[PDB]
Ligand binder design. Structure first.
Ligand SMILES: NC(=O)c1ccc[n+]([C@@H]2O[C@H](COP(=O)([O-])OP(=O)(O)OC[C@H]3O[C@@H](n4cnc5c(N)ncnc54)[C@H](O)[C@@H]3O)[C@@H](O)[C@H]2O)c1
Ligand SMILES: NC(=O)c1ccc[n+]([C@@H]2O[C@H](COP(=O)([O-])OP(=O)(O)OC[C@H]3O[C@@H](n4cnc5c(N)ncnc54)[C@H](O)[C@@H]3O)[C@@H](O)[C@H]2O)c1
Ligand SMILES: NC(=O)c1ccc[n+]([C@@H]2O[C@H](COP(=O)([O-])OP(=O)(O)OC[C@H]3O[C@@H](n4cnc5c(N)ncnc54)[C@H](O)[C@@H]3O)[C@@H](O)[C@H]2O)c1
Ligand SMILES: NC(=O)c1ccc[n+]([C@@H]2O[C@H](COP(=O)([O-])OP(=O)(O)OC[C@H]3O[C@@H](n4cnc5c(N)ncnc54)[C@H](O)[C@@H]3O)[C@@H](O)[C@H]2O)c1
Ligand SMILES: O=C(O)c1nonc1O
Ligand SMILES: O=C(O)c1nonc1O
Ligand SMILES: O=C(O)c1nonc1O
Ligand SMILES: O=C(O)c1nonc1O
Lengths: 332, 332, 332, 332
């Protein structure tokens, strides 16, 4: 009965697995594949599964990751427009939908990307009832909130791609300035991934040397020896890459593998990422925006309480108020 | 009370972890720690566990690894003489017991290591009765059979480390001869890990090209011009080495992680390991010896039925009979 | 008073970085960037330089990677129209110029890319004079040979990505039928990258045991397992995959990179990349083609002399004369 | 006739690799091997040299490592008692010596050991003059300094393992206290490696947030998080581990390999490693202790200019005195 029949001889009995650490990537767009080439690269899934709506573009992104199986450690790769392939996934990376046209704000994609999520979020929990979701599609913090509601999952099992990517954009500009590696530069961007984001100068530092101390001019526009512009650089930066190439992904893709490695390796390491911050720094409502969370195998199991300077909570309320003004009309 | 008390403001229930891929290492001797360190750097455990009777050193070793944790991806490293730490392990590596003295036959350790596996194996299955048991302690094939019989686990969940090593030495000795990577030469040693092993020359190949075809008097009573004395190299290799350094452990440490990697990441790759070979190559008893096997997330699930020449099946039957002879009296 | 002056007290006096592991990628398109990202996650380069005609897009991808830098182990990432950004490159990948149309042969792209290659390559070897060219652009064999003649480079130093990728498909396909990882299947496809690929069935083994002796009508017309349907699917591959998604890239971004591993790490393993085959199996002319060779830090230092069948050899003859028939016409 | 002749056909006529990231690890005891095994598993080296006066043992640790090759990416392992085998080396780790008996403090050692370095250090520079030298043997600053002189290498090429391990014990002990990864726990134990180290409590942060600027008791007599107790452990550590298992190797070994990664990858990350301190916080003696410092392919190339309080710099100076006192009378 072929070769498998009288070449392989079962010591067991056939046999099914049950995925252990499966991961669905939802969307096989420029972002969807970056995340996917990077999950596969760090060897993070025993099974990787693709769901997109474009059936043809899927079978071929599926097929393409398939051919390289021999360089990779992910026995099962799979793909369908039916969400039945995502069954029993441990982490689900949503990326699907429309992206910013050159100039367009992330926040002008809500109406549209919400309608996407209105369909795809609840088919994910049908198939993987006990998953962690990662939300990457834009209005990311607004949709992390939309995902939270529709999924009907705990808060520690719904995670915003957040300002993990912002904070690395930041630690990378700091790193150029200093001529070291960003692993060795520390410092944080919290709140809305994008325009309304907050630089926390209090905590910018290198080998413990607070630089809000080593120049308290730091962050104060006009004055200062340069720091204002670094934050603007981070903020503007999404737009500045879109002008030149069309979109971003190699950095988002790696951010996400980061997030997933921390979690599937149960490391409890710290990540600035979008969560529900009701009841912190004076916040009226159920607003999702990023803060230094502890990612382990549970999902995000804590936030970190920081002494912020007065101005930085001011900036963070302006953010959470913006986001809450779109979420209060949302109703689904 | 401690800063955790409100440096960390949880989003998930204090709650109840449970390790995914936990791994236990019964024994913290030279071999034992070799396995622990190789395991640790490939990052295969999200919990390591070290058992032993030497209660102090044991705690020496744990604390020493712990100190390294910054450089690993292993959140929990515990250790006690009490098989109550090993609870929930996906894999238990048993290096426990006595080893060779300068000269000593692996087969001569059987009475003593039997008597250990006797009062240790029920303790392993108590706290973890769905764990793949890797037997390393010698003689390894017989204690694989002894582990099977005491443990009540199925054939595919007791795996002797077997010829994964002999065969790596052989591929390396091969490679030496030719100027390439071990990985790029191929060639199996099956049989008793030790004196009576079998160089399946039929299969020795590079780029698919069969070297016995290229050298028909290979592995042959005198005539060849290099071969038999490599198999003689592969046999005496432990004895050559224990003599200069007291013991072996890095090689075998590293094999036991090659098997561990392929099982946890579910890769379904072929290793010659020690599995029950009744019925094969006309074998009438439940001997455990080494043959090409597929190891996946379930353990040892397949044996590759082979086309051994009339004197490979011969020398194979001869390792069989020799192990069964030492096995037949055990009677526990 | 530059923030560096204040924070970093130099010890070795000012930078002058000894480049070392430069890798250039020519052409930041789909393939270009699959190679790039795949190189980055294996930390093979400590400098990456991209080149391309498309000034905007090029700056975008450099930027995009840069931003990921925190997630990486590549200190420097640069990019520019000029070949001067590629100086000292230990290994350079040319992936630029046109590609298939839905249905178009790889050789139908020749004249176009030769004219690219004509003003790309001289430039490459002005600036990285001691380097290893890895030619992805298609047709990959004939372009490897055109690279060879123009660059002047020792022939070992011009490696075509060849049939590394096909055998990697052919090993995945055979892996599905058998239910093991591709790594544990073994089976070469040699020759031209396109439709003359030969699948050397002599070699096709698993754990030593030839799948031909198992089945001696392998890869002929009527046979039980229908082995030609695998080799045909391996030829069809690119066509099917493009038809669904406009290109292939990932699986090739992986192989380019798997080969680079073998070089920079100096492993001497055997890949079926493309190499000048004059001398071999009757071939009288300077033909590039894919035979199992050894890669190390010198590049392609040795071919494995295989013991191929009569029919199998004809086929190389087939392949080597379609290639040579294009090749001779080229205005040099 | 040689099978390498029937099988291998040389494309580049004449094999012979140029030396490259040859690393050497001096002495093959507990620390020797443990550094080695961690260097090998991080795929950092294409030539491992082992050196040691006990030939016999040394040819075993050479061999036990050679057998493991298949599982590695380090194509030449070699060992000999003549430092010839360490020619054209790039990094050389010095672990040879004698070590503390239970109770012994690290200065009991200088005499016997300084006869040790007096032998070897030249023989490094004799055979491998263009190198970085990592120093681990005790007493380790007093021998670092001893190495700077003997070798007569530039400041930036002689580094001691120094406080790296301590700040790793530190960051790990901190980790237990908050339940995150020592890699999200930031903190610096600087100065002399043994009893005299110095916890810079200002740096000690987590996620941007200063700890001292939260609980100002830190470091004094009776603090209520008990933090002088932590530094306490980071100091006692060595001793208390030596009481259980006679020595340490693993922690040290991984951390040496971390330096070796930083530097081969030319990564310019910071590491609390030992280096010449005069001109820093008022040293007048030619003496080495561990400060935050930048580790690329040039070696240690700069330090971090930090603001350090009285009772620390004091701590530093008495350290740097005791240091010189031994030193001054060193019949070089
Ligand atoms: N949060 C972040 O840090 C971050 C960063 C970069 C990009 N993004 C966002 O991620 C998204 C993806 O980026 P991209 O460049 O891959 O976009 P893309 O156009 O390249 O990909 C679109 C993908 O989503 C699918 N899609 C479109 N409409 C859909 C629908 N109704 N239902 C299901 N799938 C649909 C497409 O088939 C395709 O798979 C964008 O919205 C982008 O803004 C977020
Ligand atoms: N399969 C292989 O390729 C291979 C290779 C090398 C060594 N080995 C085996 O390793 C075993 C030990 O080798 P080693 O050099 O580590 O010796 P070792 O002396 O260094 O280690 C023995 C350890 O076992 C512990 N121990 C003894 N009885 C125990 C028990 N009943 N329960 C729990 N722990 C117990 C001891 O504390 C000691 O720490 C030997 O059987 C030897 O054959 C196997
Ligand atoms: N060997 C293989 O396994 C394999 C597989 C897939 C594709 N390919 C080949 O790879 C090549 C690239 O494929 P692709 O999918 O990236 O197409 P692509 O459209 O994505 O790549 C085009 C790139 O070529 C660049 N380019 C054109 N002229 C240039 C010049 N004169 N100097 C520098 N850069 C120039 C463009 O500016 C652009 O960046 C094609 O030739 C394709 O056929 C080979
Ligand atoms: N800096 C750190 O963080 C750190 C940590 C642990 C150990 N150490 C030091 O490392 C050293 C040994 O550690 P160990 O546990 O491996 O000791 P070990 O006994 O296990 O290793 C000693 C090795 O040094 C060799 N040696 C002795 N005299 C020699 C000589 N004259 N020439 C060449 N080699 C010689 C021996 O042959 C042996 O190979 C001690 O100095 C110890 O304090 C430093
Ligand atoms: O973060 C980005 O770069 C981004 N790109 O598209 N949307 C975004 O948010
Ligand atoms: O083969 C070995 O390495 C060995 N050494 O001691 N026991 C063994 O199995
Ligand atoms: O085979 C492929 O992947 C391919 N697609 O376009 N050129 C190629 O070589
Ligand atoms: O720090 C240590 O662990 C140490 N142990 O022995 N010597 C040392 O330096």
């Amino acid at each position: 009965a072929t070769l498998k029949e009288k070449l392989i001889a079962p010591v067991a009995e056939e046999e099914a697995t049950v995925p252990n650490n499966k991961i669905t990537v939802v969307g096989v767009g420029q972002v969807g594949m970056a995340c996917a080439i990077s999950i596969l690269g760090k060897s993070l899934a025993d099974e990787l599964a693709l769901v997109d709506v474009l059936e043809d573009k899927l079978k071929g992104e599926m097929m393409d990751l398939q051919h390289g199986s021999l360089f990779l450690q992910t026995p099962k790769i799979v793909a369908d427009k039916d969400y039945s392939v995502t069954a029993n996934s441990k982490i689900v990376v949503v990326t699907a939908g429309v992206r910013q046209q050159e100039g367009e704000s992330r926040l002008n994609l809500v109406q549209r990307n919400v309608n996407v999520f209105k369909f795809i979020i609840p088919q994910i929990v049908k198939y993987s009832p006990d998953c962690i979701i990662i939300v990457v599609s834009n209005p990311v913090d607004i949709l992390t909130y939309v995902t939270w509601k529709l999924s009907g999952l705990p808060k520690h099992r719904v995670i915003g791609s957040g300002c993990n990517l912002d904070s690395a954009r930041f630690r990378y500009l700091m790193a150029e300035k200093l001529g070291i590696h960003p692993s060795s530069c520390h410092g944080w961007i919290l709140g809305e991934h994008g325009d309304s984001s907050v630089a926390v100068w209090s905590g910018v530092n290198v080998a413990g040397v607070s630089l809000q101390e080593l120049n308290p001019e730091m962050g104060t526009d006009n004055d200062s020896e340069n720091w204002k512009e670094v934050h603007k650089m981070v903020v503007e930066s999404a737009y500045e890459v879109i002008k030149l190439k069309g979109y971003t992904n190699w950095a988002i893709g790696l951010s996400v593998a980061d997030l997933i490695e921390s979690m599937l390796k149960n490391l409890s390491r710290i990540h600035p990422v979008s969560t529900m911050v009701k009841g912190m720094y004076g916040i009226e409502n159920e607003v999702f925006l990023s803060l230094p969370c502890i990612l382990n195998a549970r999902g995000l199991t804590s936030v970190i309480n920081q002494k912020l300077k007065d101005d930085e909570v001011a900036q963070l309320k302006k953010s959470a108020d913006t986001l809450w003004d779109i979420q209060k009309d949302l109703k689904f």
